[PDB]
Design a protein around this ligand. Structure first.
Ligand SMILES: [N]
Ligand SMILES: [N]
Ligand SMILES: [Pt+2]
Ligand SMILES: [Pt+2]
Ligand SMILES: [Pt+2]
Length: 129
């Protein structure tokens, strides 16, 4: 599923991401835009052989099992394919564990490089949430 901007903001609000560990909804919408272009199906292979999955590009190195990432962990205890559903529940639940692990949203390279310290409120402008 390719979400619209306000459609995803509404879904992320429903699943408890608004102000989750102090990160406004605009931060999460910004992160999703630059990680996946709002596409639940997005996959990208990393240089270390791990792959990033779904709307928030959750990495097999630490968070999910994709059956082809040697010596990695599965800290969200999910198959990485669960992260590609039109339903964002698995991605949200796993993102809450990630953002809570001490590094906050710095885990998301696209957030650090394109969202951090910008006017993220612009990402929810006009949205009926
Ligand atoms: N949702
Ligand atoms: N969720
Ligand atoms: Pt839709
Ligand atoms: Pt939902
Ligand atoms: Pt939920």
């Amino acid at each position: 599923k390719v979400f619209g901007r306000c459609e995803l903001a509404a879904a992320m609000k429903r699943h408890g991401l608004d102000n989750y560990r102090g990160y406004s909804l605009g931060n999460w919408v910004c992160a999703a835009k630059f990680e996946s272009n709002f596409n639940t199906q997005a996959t990208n292979r990393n240089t270390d052989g791990s792959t990033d999955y779904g709307i928030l590009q959750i990495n097999s190195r630490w968070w999910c099992n994709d059956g082809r990432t040697p010596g990695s962990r599965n800290l969200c205890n999910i198959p990485c394919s669960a992260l590609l559903s039109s339903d964002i529940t698995a991605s949200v639940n796993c993102a809450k564990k990630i953002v809570s692990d001490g590094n906050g949203m710095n885990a998301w390279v696209a957030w650090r490089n394109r969202c951090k310290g910008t006017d993220v409120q612009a990402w929810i402008r006009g949205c009926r949430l």
